[PDB]
Design a protein around this ligand. Structure first.
Ligand SMILES: O=C(O)c1ccccc1C1c2ccc(O)cc2Oc2cc(O)ccc21
Ligand SMILES: O=C(O)c1ccccc1C1c2ccc(O)cc2Oc2cc(O)ccc21
Length: 291
């Protein structure tokens, strides 16, 4: 991989923090991403879920990604993922709706899925067309993407044109082979912090609850899925198992394992070339499915 990957890995290598410390730490890290001056942010009440529109000059205003941020269902915000959102808006030439879905442990499962489905229904109510829509998310948000599609389908809501999972988290038990075999080469995600966040999200519910852990959900009738994942990830086998399940359910899956990439490497696109290349691919995938 690019020499820039070492710079990122060193940043990650330099760190039992409380939830408040984890949240503040991510908000602090996000301050380092300068938001380009051509990015227009509009805060909105997305049908009872706080949100922000992210638009850039070449945003086709009728095309919309509902973006679901990562953070283990415990941390992250509209602000932490605003840079990833503006980069997707730019590559996909669309508007992005970022939502502040309810977080655990304060608001356990299924609050995140209630919020994501409510925001999607609100986009429909306010005139967005599903054939010009997609849902996308990273890590916990990638699992939330799959759960949101399952929940919308089950409620008879029309599904979007496509969906995008970046290093999705879909196994809340961490029993993928890669959780052991890639532990040595993953500088961000290990089994223990995952299980702690799963514990906060589940609040004693079955860890195979389908809308929490969509590795166990019925995926039949989902729209075309792009899964991007790094081979230097403990969560590699979450993407592999998700692709297996979706394909067995007849879903059109593109599984893209990026050699040597780390967890949500797209987030480091300002300094990591493979990050910007992966976002350009997301843009191409979405524009393909919107044609
Ligand atoms: O990053 C910013 O926009 C900013 C600018 C001036 C003062 C403070 C901030 C923020 C900020 C700076 C340091 C830090 O540790 C975190 C941090 O978090 C936020 C969060 C916001 O919602 C909104 C703003 C900030
Ligand atoms: O590490 C786990 O398996 C786990 C699971 C559920 C809740 C909390 C944790 C733990 C945990 C979470 C992340 C972290 O940074 C530190 C941490 O440490 C421990 C230590 C334990 O002895 C025992 C458990 C944990």
């Amino acid at each position: 991989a690019s020499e820039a990957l070492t710079m990122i890995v060193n940043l990650l290598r330099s760190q039992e923090p409380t939830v408040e410390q984890m949240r503040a730490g991510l908000e602090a890290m996000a301050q380092m991403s300068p938001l380009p001056a051509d990015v227009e942010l509009t805060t909105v009440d997305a049908g009872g879920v706080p949100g922000a529109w992210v638009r850039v000059p070449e945003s086709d205003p009728d095309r919309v990604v509902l973006y679901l941020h990562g953070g283990g269902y415990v941390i992250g915000s509209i602000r932490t993922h605003r840079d990833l959102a503006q980069r997707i808006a730019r590559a996909a030439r669309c508007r992005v709706l970022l939502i502040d879905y309810r977080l655990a442990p304060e608001h356990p499962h299924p609050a995140a899925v209630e919020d994501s489905t409510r925001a999607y229904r609100w986009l429909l109510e306010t005139g967005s067309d599903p054939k010009r829509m997609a849902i996308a998310g990273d890590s916990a948000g990638g699992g939330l993407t799959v759960a949101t599609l399952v929940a919308l389908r089950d409620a008879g809501v029309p599904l979007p044109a496509a969906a995008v999972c970046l290093s999705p988290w879909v196994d809340l038990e961490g029993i993928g082979e890669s959780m052991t075999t890639k532990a040595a080469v993953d500088p961000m995600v290990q089994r223990e912090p995952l299980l702690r966040m799963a514990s906060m999200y589940l609040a004693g519910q079955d860890p195979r609850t389908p809308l929490a852990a969509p590795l166990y959900a019925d995926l039949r009738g989902l729209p075309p899925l792009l899964i991007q994942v790094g081979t230097a990830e403990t969560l590699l086998d979450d993407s592999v198992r998700l692709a297996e399940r979706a394909r067995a359910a007849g879903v059109q899956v593109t599984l893209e394992p990026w050699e040597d990439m780390i967890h949500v490497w797209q987030a480091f696109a300002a300094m990591l070339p493979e990050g910007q290349q992966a976002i350009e691919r997301i843009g191409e995938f979405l524009r393909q499915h919107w044609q």
